[PDB]
Design a protein around this ligand. Structure first.
Ligand SMILES: Nc1ncnc2c1ncn2[C@@H]1O[C@H](COP(=O)(O)OP(=O)(O)OP(=O)(O)O)[C@@H](O)[C@H]1O
Ligand SMILES: Nc1ncnc2c1ncn2[C@@H]1O[C@H](COP(=O)(O)OP(=O)(O)OP(=O)(O)O)[C@@H](O)[C@H]1O
Lengths: 42, 285, 92
C-alpha cells in the first residue's frame, strides 16, 4: 500500500507545551530561504 | 553626487538585498497569551515578533518591548495580545507599517523615521508572506560596509557640533536616586528608548533602558527601588562634539550599541546621538 | 523538529480519518493516489485560495508518517492554519 532541501515546503512541528502549538516550515523566496515559526494557541 | 552618495546608494538597493540567504522568522498569533509570547521571545532570542490575526487573516503589527512597557504601566500576562492591543485600539490608531522586498532601502529608512518605529516587516505583496524584519541597525551595518569601502564625502570628516546631528534639548534623564516606576512613567511620556543616569552633579554614570525595567519586573520581586539598585541586578558609551561623524559612526557600529550620550569634559550630559539620527543625517539628508 | 504527524493505525483507516477530518473542515479535496491527496481551502475572509498536499508514507513495519506539503493574508501562515485544524481533528 503506502510508499515508504528536500524538506522545502514540508510542515514541521515542536511538541505541544502549555496549550500552544509551534508549526514551522521553510519556504523559498527567490534566492532566499525563510524558516517561519508560528506560535498559535491550541 | 559625492555629498549625496549615501542617498543614491540607498535608492539603488532593495530591502531584498539585506535579507539573509537563510533566515528564521518567529510569528505569534494574537490570541497568544502575553506571558507565553514573552517566553517565546526569550527562548528564541529575539526582542520583537510580527503579529498575525486569525480573524482578519492579516498581519496587524509588531510586539515590542514598548508594548510591554505600556502594559506594565497599567493578569497582564494572562490576557491575550489581542485584548491588550484592543485596550489601546492599536490596530486602528497605529496600524501595521510594512515594506516590500522590492522597495528601496531609502524608502525603508524614510518609513522607519517618519512613522517613529524601529521594526519594519518586509512583506511580499504577491503571497502576503512576511520575509524579514528591518531595523535601523541592520540598515546601518549595510550602509557601513559601503561607507568604509568607498570614498567618503567631506561632511563625513566634519565634527558633530559642526554637523548638528543629535538631540540636544529636552533630554530625558534619571537620577541615581530616581525610583524605577518614575522612570517607567517618563519612558511612556517621552517615547524614548533609554535614559541617561546622572548624579547630583548631572554627570552621566549609567544608562537605563526599557529592557532594564522589563527585566526587573520579570523578576517579580517592586518598582519602588531606585535606579542604581535595579542596575545592580544586571548581567557607558559617550561621544564628544569635536569628534568626527565618521568616528562617531564606527563607534556605534563597532559596539553594536544603539546610541551615544554626548557629554562635557566633566561628563555632564550635553546631547544624544542615536542610530536614527545617523541614518536621517546620511540617508534622508 | 518533527516532520508531519505519525500514526500506527492501518493505512486505509488513517486515510478514512483524514477525509472525515477534511469534510468536518469543509475543505474540498481530491485523490491523486490512494494515500496521497490535494486539499483546497478557499478563504472565508480574504476570499482567496490556499492549497496543500498530503502524502502518506510508511516509516517502519508498524508505523506510518503523514506528510503535509504546501502548494505554490499570508500563504505560509494559512498553510500552518490548514495543517493545525486537520491535526486538531486527528488529535481527537
Ligand atoms: N512596523 C510597525 N507597524 C506598526 N506598529 C509598530 C511597528 N513597529 C513597531 N510598532 C509599534 O510601535 C511601538 C514602538 O516600538 P518600536 O519597535 O519602535 O520600539 P521598541 O519598542 O523600542 O522596539 P525595539 O526593541 O525594536 O526598539 C510598539 O508599540 C510597536 O507595537
Ligand atoms: N534620552 C533621550 N532624551 C531625549 N531624546 C532622545 C533620548 N534618546 C534618544 N533621543 C532622540 O530620540 C530620537 C530617537 O531616539 P531613540 O534612541 O529611541 O531612537 P534610536 O535609538 O535612533 O532608534 P534606535 O534605538 O534603533 O537607534 C533620536 O533623535 C534621538 O536623538
Amino acid at each position: 500500500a503506502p510508499p515508504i532541501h528536500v524538506m522545502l515546503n514540508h510542515l514541521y512541528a515542536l511538541s505541544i507545551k502549555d496549550g500552544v502549538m509551534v508549526l514551522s516550515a521553510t519556504h523559498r523566496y527567490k534566492k532566499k530561504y525563510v524558516t517561519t515559526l508560528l506560535y498559535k494557541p491550541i | 553626487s559625492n555629498s549625496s552618495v549615501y542617498t543614491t546608494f540607498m535608492k539603488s538597493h532593495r530591502c531584498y538585498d539585506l535579507i539573509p540567504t537563510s533566515s528564521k522568522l518567529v510569528v505569534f498569533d494574537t490570541s497568544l497569551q502575553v506571558k507565553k509570547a514573552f517566553f517565546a521571545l526569550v527562548t528564541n532570542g529575539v526582542r520583537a515578533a510580527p503579529l498575525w490575526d486569525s480573524k482578519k487573516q492579516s498581519f496587524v503589527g509588531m510586539l515590542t518591548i514598548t508594548d510591554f512597557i505600556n502594559i506594565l504601566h497599567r493578569e497582564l500576562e494572562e490576557h491575550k495580545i489581542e485584548t491588550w492591543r484592543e485596550v489601546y485600539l492599536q490596530d486602528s490608531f497605529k496600524p501595521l507599517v510594512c515594506i516590500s522586498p522590492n522597495a528601496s532601502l531609502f524608502d525603508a529608512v524614510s518609513s522607519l523615521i517618519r512613522n517613529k518605529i524601529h521594526r519594519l516587516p518586509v512583506i511580499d505583496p504577491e503571497s502576503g508572506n512576511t520575509l524579514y524584519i528591518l531595523t535601523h541597525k541592520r540598515i546601518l551595518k549595510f550602509l557601513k560596509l559601503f561607507i568604509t569601502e568607498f570614498p567618503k564625502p567631506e561632511f563625513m570628516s566634519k565634527s558633530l557640533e559642526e554637523l548638528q546631528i543629535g538631540t540636544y534639548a529636552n533630554i530625558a534623564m534619571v537620577r541615581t536616586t530616581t525610583p524605577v516606576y518614575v522612570a517607567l512613567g517618563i519612558f511612556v511620556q517621552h517615547r524614548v528608548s533609554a535614559l541617561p543616569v546622572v548624579d547630583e552633579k548631572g554627570r552621566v554614570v549609567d544608562i537605563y533602558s526599557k529592557f532594564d525595567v522589563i527585566n526587573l519586573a520579570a523578576e517579580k520581586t517592586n518598582l519602588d527601588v531606585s535606579v542604581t539598585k535595579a542596575l545592580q541586578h544586571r548581567s557607558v558609551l559617550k561621544c564628544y562634539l569635536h569628534e568626527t561623524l565618521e568616528a562617531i559612526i564606527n563607534r556605534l557600529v563597532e559596539a553594536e550599541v544603539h546610541r551615544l550620550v554626548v557629554v562635557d569634559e566633566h561628563d555632564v550630559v550635553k546631547g544624544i546621538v542615536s542610530l536614527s539620527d545617523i541614518l536621517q543625517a546620511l540617508v534622508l539628508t | 523538529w518533527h516532520l508531519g504527524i505519525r500514526s500506527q493505525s492501518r493505512p486505509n483507516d488513517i486515510m478514512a480519518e483524514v477525509c472525515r477530518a477534511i469534510k468536518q473542515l469543509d475543505y474540498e479535496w481530491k485523490v491523486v493516489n490512494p494515500y496521497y491527496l490535494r486539499v483546497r481551502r478557499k478563504n472565508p475572509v480574504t476570499s482567496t485560495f490556499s492549497k496543500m498536499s498530503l502524502q502518506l508514507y510508511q516509516v517502519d513495519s508498524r508505523t506510518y508518517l503523514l506528510d503535509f506539503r504546501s502548494i505554490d493574508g499570508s500563504h505560509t501562515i494559512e498553510f500552518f492554519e490548514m495543517c493545525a485544524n486537520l491535526i486538531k481533528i486527528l488529535a481527537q
